[PDB]
Amino acid sequence: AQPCSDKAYKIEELFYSYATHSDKFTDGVCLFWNCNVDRYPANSIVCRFDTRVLSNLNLPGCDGGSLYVNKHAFHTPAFDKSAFVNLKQLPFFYYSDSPCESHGKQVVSDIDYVPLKSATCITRCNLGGAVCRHHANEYRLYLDAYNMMISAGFSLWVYKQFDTYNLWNTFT
Amino acid sequence: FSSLPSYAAFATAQEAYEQAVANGDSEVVLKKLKKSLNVAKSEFDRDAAMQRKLEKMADQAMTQMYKQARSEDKRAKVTSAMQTMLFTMLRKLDNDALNNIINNARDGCVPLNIIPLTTAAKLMVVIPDYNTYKNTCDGTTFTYASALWEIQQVVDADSKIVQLSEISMDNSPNLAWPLIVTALRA
Amino acid sequence: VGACVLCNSQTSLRCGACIRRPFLCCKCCYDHVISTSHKLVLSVNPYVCNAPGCDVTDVTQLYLGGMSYYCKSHKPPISFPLCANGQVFGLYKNTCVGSDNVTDFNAIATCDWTNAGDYILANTCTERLKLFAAETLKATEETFKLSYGIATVREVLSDRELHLSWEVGKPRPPLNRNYVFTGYRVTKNSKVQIGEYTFE
Amino acid sequence: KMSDVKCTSVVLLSVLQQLRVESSSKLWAQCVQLHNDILLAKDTTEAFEKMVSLLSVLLSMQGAVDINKLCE
RNA sequence: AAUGUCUGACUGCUCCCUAGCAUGCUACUACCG
RNA sequence: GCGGUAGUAGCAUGCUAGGGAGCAG
Ligand SMILES: [Zn+2]
Ligand SMILES: [Zn+2]
Ligand SMILES: [Zn+2]
Ligand SMILES: [Zn+2]
């Protein structure tokens, strides 16, 4: 709804509302990433900051929403449930696609990463071991990062047709 | 539940059933690939079920033994955890009197009773050697717990009353090192 | 879960056939299992093939097929050897040091403590191996001289109520917490243990 | 802030009691008296002076080697 | 040499975990009519 | 082509029992 000087020819000036534009962007997948609107289109990806969370950053704004101040002061409306009626929560995981920690042969001949295995780190080495120690440390750090963000209060959501099997299938 | 030979069996069953429904076969052939695929599910559901049961069983066993180990190891070490917690709290408080007496005690000056509060009620202190006496008892006054005290009697380790002016740096070896001071509140 | 008693590098492994069950980094555990009679390692789970009856307790004969542990004749088509690359499949594999003179502990473990030379060996190593030799010497004493214990059950009664019987004439040890025995059921076949057992 | 005083007084009494001080009688009575007085105080200053009077007990004994924990 | 034991009332409601049984619901397979 | 019984698994509800906890007078 506020396009810059340039990128205006890219980013068309649009304010969203499910009272209108609900029927146009039907193709593909939207992406509301911290742009707080009304109920979202059924094929969206959103990271909306929760407001009832407490901390020392966010401050009691108005009205029934809070002012979230760390860099530039962001004001966000009151958290409501009727915004995600067309979406579902996002279960945690950890996709990845990269080479394997191969201190030698690249396939089946290089493991030496002793892990009691997870069930959701859909990495590239999930055979039996099952995480190239590379991906082991990467999964550890990414898990910590997800935890910290969600503790600082960010609630993700996804379209209801989401699945996890398909990434596994993409691996092969 | 993928890492199963029964998974390969069931997947071959699904693929063959798909071939039967996609090739336009006759009526009884799809019954062979429906009765076998359904016996295939009646075995695959079953083996995946039992394996997830054994898995969750091992998992709850793990959480139980973890709970036990944690609880016992903590119960072992209360006598020290409490002390370290107490002292970090005391340091975080940051008051003048508390820190005064803690530093006096880590040097060697400890009381011999409860520090009273009224202007009466005596107070006794142990002095280890005379330097701290310089840093503290100056004349008839006495500063302890950030409050003023009047010295009224001194004595060394062998219960000998020791005159005030008697003490000095020169005569210092002429006294038992652990002196004792009896003061009152100002 | 501990520190390699030789290397201090953090180990999740213990030496099974060894009397004290100590912590040895992947390299040190490797060295012990290739330089002594100790072929059993103890971690979160005991290292053995989990095929029915496959009593493969040799550390060098196990392969991680699927999620369970397997011998050669049992490993599914997806596996690899644990005892390989100079180290063992043990946690903290990268942060492993490998002691240079494992022969020290390799001799402290496979001795009998009846010869004075073993006492010289204990007196003539570093302080860590000194206290290790202390623990293992007291352990050799108690396992030999200080009291004893084999008993064969007569019949089961309930989940925690059991008829026993030692061997007539064999040292019948006291029944205390600091007295546990390796429970062996032999099918015919299958010299498999059922764990550690104290009685009262 | 005052809550911090009340809290550290609780912890201090716990330490004293686990150092077997309740074996002696009159001393334990005094310690309990000071603790229950601190828990009900309203202003910070007199609570602080009761706190120092009560800490003097732990300092008067040689069971806790403060020169160790005062290492920061 | 032991081992072992230390003060915890009467009620009411609620959550969590496990077990058992029956019942109830649904699917797969089998036999006979 | 149907019924029935028997099995097995899945799922639910309920009741009992066992254990852990919370609040109330
Ligand atoms: Zn990899
Ligand atoms: Zn080592
Ligand atoms: Zn050994
Ligand atoms: Zn085997």
XYZ file of C-alpha atoms (C1' of nucleotides) and ligand atoms in Angstrom:
692
model
C 0.000 0.000 0.000
C 3.110 2.225 0.004
C 5.385 1.582 -2.979
C 8.766 3.274 -3.093
C 9.838 5.550 -5.943
C 11.489 2.708 -7.782
C 10.091 -0.797 -7.255
C 6.743 0.964 -7.739
C 6.765 -0.430 -11.271
C 7.450 -3.703 -9.489
C 5.484 -3.425 -6.238
C 2.082 -2.154 -7.286
C 0.398 0.001 -4.647
C -1.958 -2.419 -2.885
C -3.651 -2.466 0.488
C -5.106 -5.908 1.105
C -8.543 -6.803 2.423
C -10.354 -10.135 2.318
C -13.473 -8.097 1.582
C -12.144 -7.537 -1.950
C -8.847 -9.019 -3.156
C -9.864 -12.439 -1.778
C -10.877 -13.534 -5.266
C -7.991 -12.341 -7.469
C -4.731 -13.812 -6.172
C -6.269 -17.298 -6.341
C -3.341 -18.497 -8.458
C -0.150 -19.566 -6.699
C 0.616 -18.723 -3.085
C 0.559 -15.433 -1.211
C 3.052 -14.410 1.474
C 1.981 -12.050 4.280
C 5.236 -11.901 6.225
C 4.477 -9.509 9.082
C 2.041 -7.453 7.007
C -0.957 -7.535 9.345
C -4.310 -7.610 7.546
C -7.695 -9.269 8.009
C -8.339 -12.975 7.432
C -5.816 -14.399 5.056
C -6.319 -16.103 1.691
C -6.482 -19.874 1.894
C -3.065 -20.267 0.204
C -0.836 -17.991 2.266
C 2.260 -18.117 4.454
C 2.201 -15.783 7.446
C 4.469 -14.917 10.374
C 2.257 -12.695 12.540
C 3.713 -11.374 15.791
C 1.604 -12.339 18.790
C 0.603 -9.464 21.051
C -0.379 -10.981 24.398
C 3.180 -12.215 24.931
C 5.194 -10.339 27.535
C 8.823 -9.184 27.558
C 10.722 -5.964 27.976
C 10.585 -5.010 24.287
C 6.899 -4.801 23.462
C 5.020 -2.096 25.344
C 1.313 -1.591 26.041
C 0.054 0.218 22.964
C -3.484 0.900 21.817
C -5.886 -0.487 21.384
C -5.802 -4.023 22.691
C -2.768 -4.331 20.464
C 0.737 -3.487 21.556
C 3.662 -1.428 20.311
C 6.657 -3.614 19.549
C 9.843 -1.576 19.859
C 13.334 -2.825 19.101
C 14.643 -1.007 16.050
C 11.925 1.130 14.456
C 8.768 1.213 16.534
C 6.271 -1.226 15.047
C 2.640 -1.032 16.048
C 0.609 -4.196 15.628
C -3.142 -4.614 16.129
C -4.695 -6.889 18.723
C -4.154 -10.587 18.125
C -7.308 -12.349 16.998
C -8.167 -15.920 16.050
C -10.594 -15.215 13.194
C -7.651 -14.339 10.936
C -6.410 -17.904 10.388
C -9.737 -19.667 9.824
C -8.390 -20.673 6.401
C -4.969 -21.797 7.644
C -3.321 -24.171 10.105
C -0.299 -23.972 12.367
C 3.106 -24.913 11.032
C 4.643 -28.032 12.604
C 8.369 -27.627 13.125
C 10.837 -29.472 10.912
C 14.198 -28.832 9.239
C 14.403 -29.289 5.495
C 17.834 -29.156 3.900
C 19.629 -30.120 0.699
C 23.422 -29.943 0.538
C 26.447 -32.267 0.304
C 27.197 -34.683 3.116
C 30.080 -34.464 5.573
C 32.182 -36.877 3.531
C 35.661 -37.331 5.143
C 36.138 -39.675 2.166
C 33.505 -41.211 -0.103
C 30.384 -39.101 -0.622
C 27.768 -41.883 -0.363
C 27.230 -44.760 2.097
C 30.877 -45.000 3.082
C 30.903 -41.874 5.252
C 28.976 -41.485 8.514
C 31.010 -41.183 11.751
C 28.331 -38.914 13.161
C 26.868 -41.031 16.046
C 23.330 -39.756 16.616
C 20.281 -41.148 18.285
C 18.011 -40.114 15.500
C 15.189 -37.621 15.272
C 12.051 -38.087 13.224
C 11.713 -34.637 11.642
C 15.224 -33.527 10.595
C 14.588 -34.257 6.917
C 18.131 -33.888 5.970
C 20.277 -35.635 3.499
C 21.728 -38.359 5.489
C 18.692 -39.774 7.174
C 19.442 -43.374 6.245
C 20.106 -45.134 9.535
C 22.664 -43.069 11.441
C 21.351 -40.718 10.402
C 22.713 -37.147 10.092
C 26.069 -36.189 8.619
C 27.600 -34.583 11.597
C 27.549 -31.393 9.554
C 23.767 -31.642 9.454
C 23.803 -32.698 13.107
C 25.299 -29.419 14.275
C 23.191 -27.535 11.756
C 20.022 -29.125 13.127
C 21.056 -28.325 16.689
C 21.678 -24.650 15.952
C 18.558 -24.270 13.823
C 16.450 -25.871 16.541
C 17.814 -23.352 19.036
C 17.094 -20.483 16.646
C 13.503 -21.564 16.067
C 13.032 -21.840 19.824
C 14.357 -18.334 20.449
C 12.238 -16.707 17.761
C 9.069 -18.410 18.965
C 9.899 -17.410 22.524
C 10.157 -13.832 21.303
C 6.616 -14.374 20.135
C 6.175 -15.070 16.428
C 3.343 -17.375 15.356
C 3.596 -19.051 11.951
C 0.724 -20.550 9.969
C 0.369 -22.489 6.710
C -2.215 -23.630 4.160
C -4.106 -26.730 5.239
C -2.826 -28.811 2.315
C 0.688 -28.889 3.765
C 2.549 -32.173 4.107
C 6.016 -33.551 4.822
C 6.098 -36.822 2.853
C 6.575 -34.828 -0.347
C 9.951 -33.408 0.672
C 11.152 -36.928 1.426
C 9.925 -37.942 -2.036
C 11.785 -34.964 -3.508
C 14.968 -36.233 -1.863
C 15.054 -39.316 -4.102
C 7.284 -46.632 9.131
C 9.381 -46.918 5.971
C 12.384 -49.125 6.790
C 10.279 -52.284 6.432
C 10.433 -55.286 4.106
C 6.679 -55.294 4.637
C 6.872 -51.743 3.278
C 8.330 -53.116 0.045
C 5.613 -55.786 -0.006
C 2.802 -53.274 0.524
C 4.298 -50.826 -1.987
C 4.514 -53.543 -4.638
C 0.884 -54.317 -3.798
C -0.115 -50.677 -4.354
C 1.830 -50.500 -7.623
C 0.292 -53.718 -8.953
C -3.201 -52.590 -7.917
C -2.593 -49.316 -9.760
C -1.508 -51.284 -12.830
C -4.694 -53.362 -12.597
C -6.942 -50.297 -12.341
C -5.028 -48.415 -15.073
C -4.757 -51.213 -17.659
C -8.502 -51.891 -17.875
C -8.344 -55.479 -16.642
C -11.194 -57.938 -16.031
C -13.341 -58.364 -12.888
C -11.613 -61.179 -10.963
C -7.996 -60.034 -11.416
C -8.550 -56.864 -9.388
C -10.046 -59.100 -6.700
C -6.681 -60.861 -6.431
C -4.957 -57.486 -6.031
C -7.625 -56.295 -3.572
C -7.690 -59.368 -1.319
C -3.876 -59.552 -1.337
C -3.432 -55.796 -0.898
C -5.914 -55.896 1.986
C -4.198 -58.858 3.604
C -1.099 -56.771 2.881
C -2.582 -53.891 4.863
C -3.707 -56.316 7.581
C -0.059 -57.287 7.977
C 1.594 -53.886 7.383
C -0.673 -51.889 9.694
C 0.015 -54.614 12.247
C 3.811 -54.621 12.028
C 4.029 -50.818 11.917
C 1.679 -50.728 14.907
C 3.729 -53.137 17.002
C 6.965 -51.367 16.100
C 5.616 -47.949 17.071
C 4.360 -49.511 20.301
C 7.797 -50.882 21.164
C 9.319 -47.534 20.179
C 7.064 -45.448 22.417
C 7.612 -48.004 25.181
C 11.379 -47.581 24.995
C 10.829 -43.814 24.870
C 8.796 -43.675 28.062
C 11.345 -45.967 29.697
C 13.975 -43.412 28.719
C 12.046 -40.472 30.129
C 11.468 -42.401 33.355
C 15.110 -43.299 33.920
C 16.027 -39.710 33.059
C 13.611 -38.383 35.677
C 15.100 -40.751 38.231
C 18.717 -39.816 37.501
C 17.956 -36.095 37.606
C 16.061 -36.265 40.891
C 18.666 -38.338 42.706
C 21.646 -36.332 41.495
C 20.008 -33.117 42.637
C 19.044 -34.544 46.029
C 22.722 -35.426 46.405
C 23.998 -31.844 46.187
C 21.582 -29.618 48.119
C 24.138 -28.877 50.834
C 26.285 -26.979 48.339
C 23.701 -25.698 45.866
C 22.026 -23.863 48.733
C 25.256 -22.171 49.791
C 26.191 -20.947 46.328
C 22.652 -19.691 45.726
C 22.642 -17.869 49.054
C 25.871 -16.090 48.311
C 24.959 -15.009 44.793
C 21.768 -13.565 46.284
C 23.710 -11.760 49.008
C 26.057 -10.290 46.425
C 23.168 -9.172 44.239
C 21.551 -7.355 47.172
C 24.511 -4.957 47.517
C 24.168 -3.243 50.895
C 26.957 -1.507 52.800
C 26.666 -3.300 56.145
C 26.367 -6.789 54.672
C 29.414 -6.348 52.455
C 31.331 -4.740 55.326
C 30.910 -7.730 57.594
C 31.397 -10.288 54.804
C 34.738 -8.730 53.927
C 35.749 -8.518 57.583
C 34.898 -12.209 57.924
C 36.765 -13.280 54.795
C 39.751 -11.495 56.307
C 39.323 -12.987 59.771
C 37.137 -10.777 61.942
C 34.139 -12.762 63.195
C 31.700 -11.940 65.975
C 31.089 -14.166 68.984
C 27.329 -13.721 69.414
C 24.450 -11.997 67.692
C 25.122 -8.424 66.599
C 22.659 -6.500 68.773
C 20.607 -3.487 67.709
C 20.024 -1.307 70.781
C 22.617 1.163 72.025
C 23.197 -1.097 75.024
C 23.973 -4.810 74.611
C 27.666 -5.579 74.207
C 29.356 -6.969 71.113
C 32.524 -9.040 70.861
C 34.861 -9.395 67.883
C 37.966 -11.428 67.052
C 40.903 -9.608 65.442
C 43.466 -11.872 63.747
C 46.720 -9.874 63.833
C 47.024 -6.072 64.100
C 46.818 -4.678 60.571
C 43.031 -4.948 60.458
C 43.179 -3.264 63.859
C 44.765 -0.319 62.054
C 42.068 -0.432 59.381
C 39.382 -0.568 62.089
C 39.919 0.274 65.761
C 41.257 3.843 65.742
C 41.279 5.203 69.254
C 38.248 4.542 71.427
C 35.914 4.235 68.435
C 35.074 1.049 66.575
C 33.445 0.797 63.150
C 31.644 -2.495 62.538
C 28.571 -3.278 60.437
C 28.792 0.352 59.274
C 27.968 1.573 62.787
C 30.037 3.117 65.549
C 31.229 1.201 68.601
C 33.133 2.239 71.740
C 35.922 -0.153 72.682
C 35.662 -1.106 76.340
C 38.149 -3.983 76.816
C 40.783 -5.859 74.832
C 42.320 -9.280 75.416
C 44.569 -11.698 73.539
C 44.352 -15.482 73.144
C 45.679 -16.300 76.632
C 42.937 -14.306 78.384
C 45.201 -11.355 79.248
C 43.603 -7.918 79.468
C 45.651 -5.686 77.178
C 45.811 -1.928 77.648
C 44.809 0.310 74.745
C 47.987 2.320 74.109
C 49.938 -0.870 74.894
C 49.444 -2.003 71.283
C 51.567 -0.650 68.432
C 53.513 -1.887 65.424
C 56.720 -2.175 67.453
C 55.225 -3.991 70.450
C 53.036 -6.069 68.109
C 54.927 -9.369 68.733
C 54.277 -8.846 72.460
C 50.635 -9.940 72.101
C 48.807 -13.117 71.151
C 47.727 -12.565 67.541
C 43.982 -13.307 67.971
C 42.983 -10.227 69.946
C 39.395 -9.842 71.174
C 37.501 -6.548 71.445
C 34.380 -5.875 73.513
C 32.504 -2.811 72.273
C 29.035 -1.302 72.739
C 26.734 0.470 70.322
C 27.083 4.233 69.930
C 28.345 -40.374 29.436
C 31.653 -39.216 30.869
C 35.248 -38.247 30.180
C 37.843 -40.587 28.670
C 39.631 -41.693 31.849
C 42.877 -41.471 29.875
C 42.096 -38.535 27.576
C 39.370 -36.587 29.469
C 37.703 -36.256 26.066
C 34.012 -36.758 26.664
C 32.933 -40.388 26.286
C 29.504 -42.044 26.267
C 31.037 -45.521 26.315
C 32.131 -48.051 28.926
C 34.353 -51.127 28.713
C 32.167 -54.183 29.274
C 34.596 -57.023 29.944
C 36.650 -54.542 31.969
C 36.154 -54.745 35.708
C 35.480 -51.060 36.368
C 33.580 -50.265 33.140
C 35.494 -47.031 32.454
C 35.140 -44.222 29.929
C 37.323 -44.417 26.828
C 37.238 -42.059 23.861
C 36.439 -43.697 20.532
C 40.169 -43.949 19.819
C 41.048 -45.168 23.323
C 38.180 -47.663 23.322
C 39.391 -48.809 19.905
C 42.907 -49.249 21.290
C 41.712 -51.240 24.302
C 39.483 -53.544 22.252
C 42.264 -54.248 19.744
C 45.010 -54.531 22.391
C 43.320 -56.621 25.111
C 40.670 -59.286 25.680
C 37.971 -56.625 26.173
C 35.529 -56.882 23.263
C 32.402 -55.552 25.024
C 31.535 -51.845 25.213
C 28.734 -50.334 27.303
C 26.896 -47.140 26.357
C 23.245 -46.178 26.633
C 22.621 -49.695 25.286
C 24.878 -52.749 25.469
C 26.641 -53.472 22.196
C 25.341 -56.762 20.786
C 23.431 -58.076 17.785
C 19.707 -57.880 18.450
C 18.688 -60.738 16.197
C 17.016 -63.442 18.308
C 19.810 -65.253 20.105
C 22.690 -63.637 18.221
C 25.130 -63.303 21.124
C 27.750 -61.380 19.139
C 29.526 -59.498 21.935
C 32.671 -58.878 19.891
C 32.877 -55.118 19.366
C 34.477 -55.769 15.970
C 31.554 -57.793 14.556
C 28.667 -55.325 14.896
C 27.084 -53.222 12.159
C 24.383 -50.567 12.494
C 21.650 -51.890 10.246
C 18.459 -49.872 10.382
C 17.940 -48.692 13.949
C 18.997 -51.846 15.817
C 22.460 -53.403 16.101
C 23.383 -56.354 13.912
C 26.064 -58.914 13.189
C 27.258 -59.626 9.664
C 24.755 -62.443 9.137
C 21.972 -60.115 10.314
C 22.708 -56.613 9.014
C 20.067 -55.448 6.508
C 21.367 -54.002 3.213
C 21.898 -50.582 4.884
C 24.718 -50.545 7.440
C 28.418 -50.011 8.213
C 31.035 -51.280 10.706
C 31.215 -49.606 14.098
C 34.762 -50.718 14.945
C 36.448 -48.869 12.074
C 38.513 -45.773 11.240
C 40.662 -46.237 14.341
C 37.667 -45.193 16.431
C 34.324 -46.670 17.493
C 30.804 -45.490 16.724
C 30.617 -43.388 19.873
C 29.366 -39.930 20.717
C 31.845 -37.044 20.424
C 33.793 -38.971 17.794
C 35.481 -35.854 16.411
C 36.607 -34.660 19.854
C 38.621 -37.804 20.535
C 42.276 -37.779 21.597
C 43.453 -41.382 21.911
C 46.012 -42.008 24.642
C 49.504 -42.850 23.437
C 50.434 -45.535 26.003
C 47.152 -47.407 26.428
C 49.380 -50.404 27.214
C 49.399 -48.994 30.758
C 45.696 -49.525 31.390
C 45.735 -52.476 28.976
C 48.012 -54.211 31.485
C 46.221 -52.885 34.579
C 42.982 -54.406 33.270
C 44.201 -57.860 32.208
C 46.288 -58.690 35.298
C 45.614 -60.577 38.520
C 47.228 -58.270 41.133
C 48.967 -61.267 42.747
C 52.382 -60.224 41.394
C 54.408 -57.408 42.931
C 55.267 -56.121 39.453
C 51.645 -55.112 38.956
C 51.941 -53.096 42.168
C 55.055 -51.451 40.731
C 53.025 -50.672 37.611
C 50.331 -49.042 39.748
C 52.945 -47.089 41.721
C 54.685 -45.980 38.515
C 52.092 -44.214 36.363
C 50.335 -40.844 36.474
C 47.944 -39.941 39.274
C 44.868 -40.639 37.141
C 46.040 -44.173 36.386
C 47.111 -44.315 40.030
C 43.540 -43.859 41.263
C 42.314 -46.097 38.444
C 44.684 -48.842 39.589
C 43.441 -48.196 43.123
C 39.806 -48.758 42.172
C 40.653 -51.795 40.050
C 42.855 -53.299 42.767
C 40.115 -52.986 45.375
C 37.766 -54.444 42.764
C 40.097 -57.390 42.166
C 40.229 -57.939 45.927
C 36.469 -57.897 46.421
C 35.824 -60.066 43.350
C 38.346 -62.560 44.568
C 38.897 -62.685 48.353
C 36.037 -60.534 49.747
C 32.875 -62.763 49.677
C 31.251 -64.355 46.628
C 27.973 -65.703 44.830
C 26.316 -67.966 42.218
C 22.809 -69.211 42.776
C 20.299 -71.109 40.695
C 16.610 -70.332 41.100
C 14.282 -73.131 42.170
C 11.047 -71.668 40.774
C 9.264 -68.361 40.275
C 6.590 -67.239 42.717
C 5.616 -63.673 41.767
C 7.070 -60.604 40.059
C 9.425 -59.960 42.994
C 9.223 -63.243 44.919
C 11.509 -66.080 43.916
C 12.905 -69.386 45.159
C 16.703 -69.596 44.940
C 19.495 -72.041 45.747
C 23.240 -71.635 45.597
C 25.564 -74.498 44.734
C 26.081 -76.750 47.769
C 29.492 -75.739 49.099
C 29.945 -72.686 46.885
C 30.511 -69.336 48.666
C 27.035 -68.038 49.512
C 27.529 -64.262 49.601
C 25.483 -61.891 51.771
C 22.376 -60.348 50.244
C 22.942 -56.590 50.075
C 22.732 -53.725 47.603
C 26.504 -53.839 47.130
C 26.111 -57.427 45.897
C 24.749 -57.945 42.377
C 25.062 -60.885 40.005
C 24.881 -61.337 36.234
C 21.611 -63.098 35.467
C 22.200 -65.813 32.867
C 19.520 -67.831 31.096
C 20.953 -70.439 28.737
C 18.322 -71.759 26.340
C 20.560 -74.445 24.843
C 22.144 -72.188 23.082
C 21.861 -68.466 23.889
C 24.156 -67.709 26.804
C 22.243 -64.428 27.145
C 22.236 -62.226 30.229
C 19.062 -60.733 31.704
C 20.785 -57.890 33.538
C 22.189 -57.132 36.962
C 20.467 -58.398 40.084
C 20.592 -57.652 43.798
C 18.648 -59.794 46.250
C 17.413 -59.642 49.832
C 13.430 -4.935 46.194
C 12.004 -5.748 49.593
C 10.867 -9.059 48.133
C 14.532 -9.835 47.512
C 15.247 -9.347 51.213
C 12.398 -11.644 52.222
C 13.597 -14.266 49.748
C 17.230 -14.291 50.806
C 16.113 -14.494 54.433
C 14.159 -17.648 53.604
C 17.229 -19.171 51.967
C 19.458 -18.189 54.874
C 17.224 -19.814 57.457
C 17.152 -22.955 55.341
C 20.949 -23.078 55.299
C 21.163 -22.519 59.056
C 18.657 -25.264 59.811
C 20.514 -27.724 57.623
C 23.716 -26.850 59.494
C 22.175 -28.543 62.569
C 21.655 -25.266 64.456
C 18.242 -26.364 65.698
C 19.986 -28.856 67.987
C 20.830 -25.975 70.266
C 17.658 -24.443 71.631
C 17.624 -20.718 72.468
C 19.677 -19.924 69.373
C 17.110 -21.572 67.117
C 14.359 -19.642 68.880
C 16.118 -16.370 68.116
C 16.743 -17.307 64.481
C 13.102 -18.248 63.972
C 12.056 -14.997 65.626
C 14.156 -12.861 63.294
C 13.037 -14.784 60.205
C 9.341 -14.442 61.006
C 9.860 -10.754 61.768
C 11.573 -10.146 58.436
C 8.803 -11.901 56.543
C 6.219 -9.426 57.909
C 8.213 -6.182 57.782
C 6.960 -3.253 55.723
C 9.927 -0.912 55.248
C 13.330 -1.846 53.914
C 15.698 -0.324 56.466
C 14.741 -2.183 59.631
C 14.425 -5.357 57.580
C 18.032 -4.829 56.528
C 19.216 -4.453 60.116
C 17.371 -7.596 61.170
C 18.984 -9.289 58.169
C 22.480 -8.359 59.289
C 21.749 -9.358 62.882
C 20.606 -12.763 61.629
C 23.508 -13.270 59.227
C 25.854 -12.676 62.153
C 24.836 -16.143 63.352
C 26.107 -17.917 60.249
C 29.256 -15.827 60.360
C 29.935 -16.687 64.004
C 30.516 -20.342 63.104
C 33.246 -22.082 61.123
C 31.206 -24.603 59.130
C 30.954 -22.561 55.933
C 34.313 -21.468 54.494
C 33.291 -18.168 52.945
C 36.821 -17.529 51.687
C 36.018 -20.181 49.079
C 32.692 -18.964 47.692
C 33.803 -15.326 47.825
C 35.849 -16.007 44.690
C 33.109 -14.602 42.409
C 28.635 -56.638 61.616
C 23.861 -56.439 61.270
C 19.678 -54.925 58.120
C 15.186 -52.048 58.675
C 11.538 -48.035 60.838
C 10.556 -42.743 62.297
C 4.950 -36.873 63.941
C 1.191 -36.357 57.830
C -6.669 -36.014 60.322
C -11.543 -36.039 58.181
C -14.014 -34.763 53.686
C -15.056 -32.661 48.743
C -13.661 -31.508 43.939
C -10.149 -31.467 39.775
C -6.098 -32.567 36.358
C -2.294 -36.174 34.585
C -0.351 -41.278 33.830
C -1.017 -46.597 33.698
C -3.664 -51.176 33.928
C -7.920 -54.298 33.515
C -12.755 -55.748 31.953
C -16.938 -55.485 29.740
C -19.686 -52.773 26.633
C -20.192 -49.759 22.407
C -18.432 -48.210 17.207
C -15.519 -49.284 12.460
C -12.447 -52.077 9.169
C -9.721 -56.901 7.490
C -10.048 -62.296 7.217
C -12.596 -67.188 7.866
C -16.667 -70.815 8.022
C -21.682 -72.190 7.405
C -26.610 -71.255 6.054
C -25.623 -61.029 -4.095
C -27.126 -61.124 1.254
C -27.105 -63.011 6.748
C -24.664 -65.013 10.753
C -20.897 -66.390 13.948
C -15.901 -66.475 14.866
C -11.115 -64.061 14.790
C -7.579 -59.868 14.535
C -6.242 -54.891 14.416
C -7.660 -49.756 14.731
C -10.713 -46.298 17.199
C -14.101 -44.410 21.027
C -16.955 -44.046 25.347
C -17.833 -45.585 30.310
C -16.430 -48.138 34.833
C -13.212 -50.128 38.257
C -8.481 -50.321 40.053
C -3.351 -48.434 40.840
C -0.046 -44.238 41.059
C 1.496 -38.739 40.884
C -0.301 -33.929 41.914
C -3.501 -29.234 42.903
C -7.153 -26.492 45.434
C -10.900 -25.941 49.217
C -13.088 -26.273 54.723
Zn 25.418 -35.320 4.667
Zn 41.200 -41.411 25.123
Zn 38.757 -52.897 29.966
Zn 24.110 -61.227 14.664
